[PDB]
């Protein structure tokens, strides 16, 4: 059983959510939830929603007893970025990268 759970085109940048991912990597879901609950980042709530969805898929589509579940594979990879032109001084123009990322969560009992 794998019960993956992906959230693509997340608003936050891939880097900024990796810090949150490292906090819960390898840890049991029980401690994962509270850590994300009390972490002061939007990446915390962004990742928390994905982790909640992953637990729901495991409980519903697969075996119950979500208590004995651990986040085996947590990773983030940057996704498509949006190009925006922003004026600067002296009439110059620069490109603003509204970066996005895909968050993948894998929770397994063993």
């Amino acid at each position: 059983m794998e019960t993956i759970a992906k959230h693509r085109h997340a608003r936050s940048s891939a880097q900024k959510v990796r810090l949150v991912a490292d906090l819960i990597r390898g840890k049991k879901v029980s401690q994962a939830l509270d850590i994300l609950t009390y972490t002061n980042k939007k990446a915390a709530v962004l990742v928390k929603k994905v982790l909640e969805s992953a637990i729901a898929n495991a409980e519903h589509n697969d075996g119950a007893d979500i208590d004995d579940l651990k986040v085996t594979k947590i990773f983030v990879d940057e996704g498509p970025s949006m190009k925006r032109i922003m004026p600067r001084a002296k009439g110059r123009a620069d490109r603003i990268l509204k970066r996005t990322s895909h968050i993948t969560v894998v929770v397994s009992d063993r």
Partner: peptide
Amino acid sequence: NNRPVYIPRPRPPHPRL
């Protein structure tokens, strides 16, 4: 994706004379 159109005149160099 337009290449920069207006390039400003370069800053005058220090006189090495």
